[PDB]
Amino acid sequence: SSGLVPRGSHMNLKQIAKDTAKTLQSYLTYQALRTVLAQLGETNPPLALWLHNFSAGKVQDGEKYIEELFLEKPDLALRIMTVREHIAEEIAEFLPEMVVTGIQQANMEKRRQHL
Amino acid sequence: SSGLVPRGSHMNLKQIAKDTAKTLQSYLTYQALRTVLAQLGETNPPLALWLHNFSAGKVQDGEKYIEELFLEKPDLALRIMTVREHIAEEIAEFLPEMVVTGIQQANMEKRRQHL
Numbered sequence: 001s002s003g004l005v006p007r008g009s010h011m012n013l014k015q016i017a018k019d020t021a022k023t024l025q026s027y028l029t030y031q032a033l034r035t036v037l038a039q040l041g042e043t044n045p046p047l048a049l050w051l052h053n054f055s056a057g058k059v060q061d062g063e064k065y066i067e068e069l070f071l072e073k074p075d076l077a078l079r080i081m082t083v084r085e086h087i088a089e090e091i092a093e094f095l096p097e098m099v100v101t102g103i104q105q106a107n108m109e110k111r112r113q114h115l
Numbered sequence: 116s117s118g119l120v121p122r123g124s125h126m127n128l129k130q131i132a133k134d135t136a137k138t139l140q141s142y143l144t145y146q147a148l149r150t151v152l153a154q155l156g157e158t159n160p161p162l163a164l165w166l167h168n169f170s171a172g173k174v175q176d177g178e179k180y181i182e183e184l185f186l187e188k189p190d191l192a193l194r195i196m197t198v199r200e201h202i203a204e205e206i207a208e209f210l211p212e213m214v215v216t217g218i219q220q221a222n223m224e225k226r227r228q229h230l
Binding site: 039092 | 128132133135136149202203210213215
């Protein structure tokens with residue numbers, strides 16, 4: 001046999017997908033927080049200022065952020081919960097085609113100039 | 116007299132999708148990096164070390180990252196380009212469900228723990 005060659009390609013695909021979904025969920029929670037924030041910009045300027053200062057730097061993990069915002073203001077956490085979910089239902093189905101063709105197009109550019 | 120009620124909800128969907136897609140693209144780039152790093156850990160330990168040290172604090176923007184890598188190691192850049200492309204082609208189609216039902220389950224777990 002020949003065993004200088006690796007047994008695998010190192011694409012643990014369900015782990016990568018699992019990790020990717022949790023990153024999408026955290027970014028969509030950040031997007032929802034941006035929405036709720038802009039809404040409260042029209043609707044409730046104080047409450048907006050509280051949330052903007054509360055959230056600065058907290059945006060790391062979306063589920064940890066939510067459980068921590070629930071401890072302070074259960075209603076506003078719920079506002080972000082609804083919006084993150086509304087966005088996801090509206091946009092998620094377009095993401096596959098955008099990322100696949102996005103990557104193919106970005107690569108195609110660079111292989112053209114370099115290669 | 117719908118004076119106080121806002122025109123719309125600040126859910127700019129084309130912009131949100133665009134931005135979510137770029138974040139996705141640049142997470143998949145980072146995950147392609149992890150794969151080839153691991154591959155190289157087996158096949159070329161010194162080059163794995165070079166790539167790891169080179170990459171540290173460079174993975175925020177996937178296109179910027181690949182272009183920086185092209186100047187030093189066009190071989191590796193092309194490898195990452197292929198892996199990110201492959202990853203996307205395998206997993207992209209399953210992300211909409213995973214993100215939608217993940218958000219819906221995560222939301223509903225947060226209400227069950229607290230509310």
